[PDB]
Write a protein that binds this ligand. Structure first.
Ligand SMILES: CC(=O)N[C@@H]1[C@@H](O)[C@H](O)[C@@H](CO)O[C@H]1O
Length: 162
């Protein structure tokens, strides 16, 4: 069994927030969103995760896409399971597997996710739509007609440059 228990729209990173080429502001996992309970799963239900970044790919760095916000600022993006360190560097604008998934036993548990980004200097940024994450039922399991996708928006912030 499965049911949706999270929020549809989700803000990424704390509002306002101030931070001090291309240069990568290493903010760790601070500019992100994390929720371990987005879905309610039970009875051998198997689920994984797919991620999608809608921002334009303005470049590539060490393998992952540099998504653009402004002609001056860009982002590196990670999506995946609940724990931050278990993310997947995002590349492109297509649905990608960001978490291979698991299967809950004969009991009640949940499926979460996490998302974090890092500023990239190519200042201030206005809140912008980032992308989405969808649960991926498998091994026979199906989403039925329960909400499968959630979205993410980056809260405005500023980079105290040099
Ligand atoms: C701890 C919790 O509430 N449920 C977690 C869920 O967030 C996570 O997505 C899943 C797969 O790793 O493992 C569950 O145990």
């Amino acid at each position: 069994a499965v049911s949706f228990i999270g929020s549809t729209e989700n803000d990424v990173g704390p509002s306002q927030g101030s931070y001090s080429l291309p240069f990568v502001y290493d903010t760790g996992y601070n500019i992100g969103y994390q929720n371990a309970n987005v879905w309610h799963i039970s009875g051998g239900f198997c689920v994984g995760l797919d991620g999608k970044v809608d921002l334009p790919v303005v470049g590539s760095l060490d393998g992952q896409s540099i998504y653009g916000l402004t002609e001056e600022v860009g982002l590196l993006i990670w999506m995946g399971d609940t724990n931050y360190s278990r993310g997947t560097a995002m590349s492109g604008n297509s649905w990608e597997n960001v978490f291979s998934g698991w299967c809950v036993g004969n009991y009640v548990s949940t499926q979460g996710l996490s998302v974090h980004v890092r500023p990239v200097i190519l200042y201030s940024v206005q809140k912008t739509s980032i992308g989405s994450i969808r649960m991926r039922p498998y091994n026979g399991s199906s989403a039925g007609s329960v909400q499968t996708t959630v979205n993410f928006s980056l809260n405005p912030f500023t980079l105290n440059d040099t």
